[PDB]
Ligand binder design. Structure first.
Ligand SMILES: [Mg+2]
Ligand SMILES: [Mg+2]
Ligand SMILES: [Mg+2]
Ligand SMILES: [Mg+2]
Ligand SMILES: [Mg+2]
Ligand code: NA
Ligand code: NA
Ligand code: NA
Ligand code: NA
Lengths: 1011, 204
């Protein structure tokens, strides 16, 4: 038989699914959730051997350990140990599409383990082995005898081993196949790995056992009363003496208990379930669960003799909460949710797809620290510990079946096929059976990108029938089909329709009110955070808030899926698609995270944090209105710091305690601020600070901020009468200006400032020139490649229009000596193949103070694709340590992504002014800057800038950040105008019209002087 | 207008006049206007205007120049949006083309007189011997802005001596979602803080 090429065989001899078991024999240990002696971990060192095919595996390996084998850590992905290559592919299958067949060359991982079993385990009861995650299919032998087979890489596989194990030493033999018919339903946008990547354990259960238990909570109208209903099921001999006691604990206080014998109510004409019981406990004024306040109870389930012999005890954390969709709104405990979510893949730069507690906690700390309240299990059931953590810290979970068939043509070819229903159902049913008790899980998902098939309908109904407590969602086949309770599009824009045939992505605002439509809209995927992205993010959150039935979304995605590789010197670097010899690959498309692989934040993460704020603010005179977006909690760990500053210089500050009811408001009256004499703009800045530590944040954490412009005094005082008059020297090649120790040189052949002198030292390595192009972002490139050009993408439009190779023809270059200054006037035309793209007219005015006033006026042709930027650049000879500016900061910001930025006097070391995006591009811009200080230099005006050791050319010519070499000096980019970054998706033009440079005629002015 | 600066310079082939003005009310500077005038050998006067607007002042109705010409010509010829009156938030009907109309058509007889007769996106304007060039909005009539705001009925208007010209770099939207509250949408409010426009005045 070839079971790994048969969608009719998804397992052999596998035990039934169920919620997390520990088989406690003491009820207090169950209650306290302390470790169980009946649940052993088999994690540790195993013997591993790699083979090109299952046929290649030597018959002796079943009976005896192989000498060639190596000792490896388990859990692990065998790609991470370097046995074969991890493959990154986006849509296209890593194998030839020929269901259900896989290549005869199938990388086979032979794991083994010699382990010990106590006599006591074999003298009584049942001894089983649980494999939490095996990718993608595996056969299991024990002591040489075959046990079974199993598929689905993301759910536990369990087998009874009692009749196989002997006292003391035993040996496992797990032959794991990389490819199987299972792989056809596992086509997620991620690294294609394999092996025993989750926990392995041994569970001893009594013969007469708890085989399943469902916990439910239902509520009276105002949620002041609840009935906890627990349905318990058993295996073994049914006897009159059997009972179940379900007790409910709140810390140490037992709030409810119920005891009944077995034998459920009459179900049908043949009776009821004699092997079942339902316990109903009344709970007065229950503490409710939410991501805001994750109140938990502990439910202990005791199977026992009536006379008081505990046979075994299972347990779980209970969260009293209700999820329902009413009148088109998704409600948690009667209140409409606002999903501040992110899509999270299980990824580690070093370990691949093996999850650990430390990492999982770090993710949840960071998510909650950045105002996320939800997470999508994209696109599979997660590690069991994740759901427990979300229960405890507080995050709404979308639990998603392991069904992705994205590379099928058409996408629903398998999911419409009734012969593929058995395999699909197990990915849905065994998910529900495992996780249905977790309070954190609020929504079920039928998978991702598998079109819409009749199998989606059958399964949707199955979950509705089995579990009435949670809405079922699914995006495939149009995101509003009969398979989903929530409209859940991916990358639907706020206002713009993308009306594809059959599966249009309507404006989310437009979608809600289509003829006959009523359901809530929460995007399963939005704001593609690929490279320099997240532009246009605020547009989403303005809409989410304005529209009741727009209840948020899940950002794509959490972490960059980059992997650590090592160079000739042994130095680590972040690698992506293709870097492991893997081909075909979708290159850097695996990196779309708000955080890097090592969990270092991208600059976009702060933009998400600002938008997902839980407190809204308005200003009216001296009164600040604070509005709470919390649904259940009071502002009981919050105060408001406020700061008024004249262009960076602190004027007045104070603290006011935040006392806002959920959905409520607080009017905070500011003290009469004494206005200053000196000119400038007053800036109010408020920050919500948490004075006290929490489970998720430290004392002094900042949860929210906002800024306003207050009064402005425009400067009417002019500089003093100049102490000298600058001299001009004329040559055929050059205009040269001299004043004190300052010197300027304008080349008359080129028409640019080609050198500058402070004292006697050079100041330039490259002349000051106009620049209308940028090192293309990931959103600029889209899907375009050298082999396969996408002409619609921005980068190709600029290339084809000739923007990158257009050369400056000089039209005018003159010098005039004024009464107190010298005036250099120039004009340039940028041309490509007989087409004028840009004209740049400048005046440079240099007076007796030592200041150079540059005035730029640029014309852009209407029929040329809008330029990336409209500015200047040069390579300064200086290399300073610090960058000091008055403008938006501290972090990187761009026109369509600058709401999180605040205007203040910022001071950073040079290296921070560069964002190390793994795929190098235009980066580190700071907008709305009025003054920039770098070493001896000061620039003043109203500009946008970046400043680093790397040129735009080097940036656009390098594919990985580690290959970047610091150039001589410092590359300075000062733009009057910069195009938006986009990011609604990363495969088609996504920069909004209002952030495109399309005015035709642009003006900006800079003053360059020594500070 | 309080003068801050007024200089004259001589270029190789031109005279350069630089001016600075502040608009103050109760010790508050509302608007700063910085100008250059470049009259060259062709007889053409290049005017460059750079305006600051105080952030805590209500956004201005317009940013432009005005003057009363001695001339009274019979026709008004321009290259821009028309032929009818058009405003920033009401210029979709108007077409960019060459238009020529008698002066009276450049005035709109609203029973309750107000700002009227404007045309946007204009690159060239012709009146008598005068030509104005750039990228501006304009109205042209025998009625001043002052007479219009002080007169309640159209029939009570008298034609003033000469011709009143308003050339704006930037004009605020007119609105009208209703007429009892502010209805000029944000994108049509003059709130950028710093405004630049350049004009050429010459003869033809
Ligand atoms: Mg199979
Ligand atoms: Mg007890
Ligand atoms: Mg490829
Ligand atoms: Mg704001
Ligand atoms: Mg039109
Ligand atoms: Na909403
Ligand atoms: Na991706
Ligand atoms: Na690059
Ligand atoms: Na009037």
């Amino acid at each position: 038989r070839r079971d790994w090429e048969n969608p009719g065989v998804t397992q052999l001899n596998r035990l039934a699914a169920h919620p997390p078991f520990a088989s406690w024999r003491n009820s207090e240990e169950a209650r306290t959730d302390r470790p169980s002696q009946q649940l052993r971990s088999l994690n540790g060192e195993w013997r591993f051997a790699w083979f090109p095919a299952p046929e290649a595996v030597p018959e002796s390996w079943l009976e005896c350990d192989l000498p060639e084998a190596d000792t490896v850590v388990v859990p692990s992905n065998w790609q991470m140990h370097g046995y074969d290559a991890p493959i990154y592919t986006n849509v296209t299958y890593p194998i030839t599409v020929n269901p259900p067949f896989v290549p005869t060359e199938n990388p086979t991982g032979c794991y083994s383990l010699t382990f010990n079993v106590d006599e006591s385990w074999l003298q009584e009861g049942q001894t089983r082995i649980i494999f939490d995650g095996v990718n993608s299919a595996f056969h299991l032998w024990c002591n040489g005898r075959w046990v079974g087979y199993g598929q689905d890489s993301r759910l536990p596989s369990e087998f009874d081993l009692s009749a196989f194990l002997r006292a003391g030493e035993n040996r496992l033999a797990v032959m794991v196949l990389r490819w199987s018919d299972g792989s056809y339903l596992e086509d997620q946008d991620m690294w294609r790995m394999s092996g025993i990547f989750r926990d392995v354990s041994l569970l001893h259960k009594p013969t007469t056992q708890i085989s399943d238990f469902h916990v439910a909570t239902r509520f009276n109208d105002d949620f002041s009363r609840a009935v906890l209903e627990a349905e318990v099921q058993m295996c073994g001999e049914l006897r009159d003496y059997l009972r179940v006691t379900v007790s409910l604990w709140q810390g140490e206080t037992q709030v409810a208990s119920g005891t009944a014998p077995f034998g459920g109510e009459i179900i049908d004409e043949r009776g009821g379930y004699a092997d079942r019981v339902t316990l109903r406990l009344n709970v007065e004024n229950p503490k409710l669960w939410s991501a805001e306040i994750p109140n938990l109870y502990r439910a202990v389930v005791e199977l026992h003799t009536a006379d008081g012999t505990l046979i075994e005890a299972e347990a779980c954390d209970v969260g009293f909460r209700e999820v329902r969709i009413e009148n088109g709104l998704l409600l948690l405990n009667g209140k409409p949710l606002l999903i501040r979510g992110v899509n999270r893949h299980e990824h580690h730069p070093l370990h691949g797809q093996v999850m650990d507690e430390q990492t999982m906690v770090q993710d949840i700390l960071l998510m909650k620290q950045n105002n996320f309240n939800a997470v999508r299990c994209s696109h599979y059931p997660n590690h069991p510990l994740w759901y427990t953590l979300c229960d405890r810290y507080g995050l709404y979970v979308v639990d998603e079946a392991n069904i992705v068939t994205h590379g099928m043509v058409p996408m629903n070819r398998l999911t419409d096929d009734p012969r593929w229903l058995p395999a699909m159902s197990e990915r849905v049913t065994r998910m529900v059976q495992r996780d249905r008790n977790h309070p954190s899980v609020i929504i079920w998902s039928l998978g991702n990108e598998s079109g819409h098939g009749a199998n989606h309908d059958a399964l949707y109904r199955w979950i509705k029938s089995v579990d009435p407590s949670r809405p079922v969602q699914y995006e495939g086949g149009g995101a509003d089909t009969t398979a989903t309770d929530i409209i859940c599009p991916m990358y639907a824009r706020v206002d713009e329709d993308q009306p594809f045939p059959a599966v249009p992505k309507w404006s989310i605002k437009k979608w809600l009110s289509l003829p006959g439509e009523t359901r809530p809209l929460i995007l399963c995927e939005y704001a593609h955070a690929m490279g320099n992205s997240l532009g246009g993010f605020a547009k989403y959150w303005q809409a989410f808030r304005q529209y009741p039935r727009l209840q948020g979304g899940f950002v794509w995605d959490w972490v960059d899926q980059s992997l650590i590789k090592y160079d000739e010197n042994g130095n680590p670097w972040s690698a992506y698609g293709g870097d492991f010899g893997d081909t075909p690959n979708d290159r850097q498309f695996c990196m779309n995270g708000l955080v890097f692989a090592d969990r270092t934040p991208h600059p976009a993460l702060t933009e998400a944090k600002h938008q997902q704020q839980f407190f809204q603010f308005r200003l009216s005179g001296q009164t600040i209105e604070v509005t709470s977006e919390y649904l259940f909690r009071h502002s009981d760990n919050e105060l408001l710091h406020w700061m008024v500053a004249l262009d960076g210089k602190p004027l007045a500050s104070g603290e006011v305690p935040l006392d806002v009811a959920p959905q409520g408001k607080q009017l905070i009256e500011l003290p009469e601020l004494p206005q200053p004499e000196s000119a400038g703009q007053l800036w109010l800045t408020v920050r919500v600070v948490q004075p006290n530590a929490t489970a998720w944040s430290e004392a002094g954490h900042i949860s929210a901020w906002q800024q306003w412009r207050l009064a402005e005094n425009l400067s009417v005082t002019l500089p003093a009468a100049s102490h000298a008059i600058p001299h001009l020297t004329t040559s055929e090649m050059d205009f040269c200006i001299e004043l004190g120790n300052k010197r300027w040189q304008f080349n008359r052949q080129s028409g640019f400032l080609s050198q500058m002198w402070i004292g006697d030292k050079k100041q330039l390595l490259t002349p000051l020139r106009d620049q209308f192009t940028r090192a293309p972002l990931d959103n600029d490139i889209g899907v375009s490649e050298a082999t396969r050009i996408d002409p619609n993408a921005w980068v190709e439009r600029w290339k084809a229009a000739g923007h990158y190779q257009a050369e400056a023809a000089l039209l005018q270059c003159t010098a005039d000596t004024l009464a107190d200054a010298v005036l250099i006037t120039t004009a340039h035309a940028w041309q490509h193949q007989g087409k004028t793209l840009f004209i740049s007219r400048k005046t440079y005015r240099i007076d007796g103070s030592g200041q150079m006033a540059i005035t730029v006026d640029v014309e852009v042709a209407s029929d040329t694709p809008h330029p990336a930027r409209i500015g200047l650049n040069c390579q300064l000879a200086q290399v300073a340590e610090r960058v000091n500016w008055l403008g938006l900061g501290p972090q990187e910001n761009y026109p369509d992504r600058l709401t999180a930025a605040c205007f203040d006097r910022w001071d950073l070391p040079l290296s921070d002014m560069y964002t190390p995006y793994v795929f190098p591009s235009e980066n580190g811009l700071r907008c709305g800057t009025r003054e920039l200080n770098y070493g001896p230099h000061q620039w003043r005006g109203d500009f946008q800038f970046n400043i680093s050791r790397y040129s735009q050319q080097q940036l656009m010519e390098t594919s990985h950040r580690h290959l970047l070499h610091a150039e001589e000096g410092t590359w300075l980019n000062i733009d009057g105008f910069h195009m938006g970054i986009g990011g609604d998706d990363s495969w088609s033009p996504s920069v909004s019209a209002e952030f495109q440079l399309s005015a035709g005629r642009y003006h900006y002015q800079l003053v360059w002087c020594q500070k």
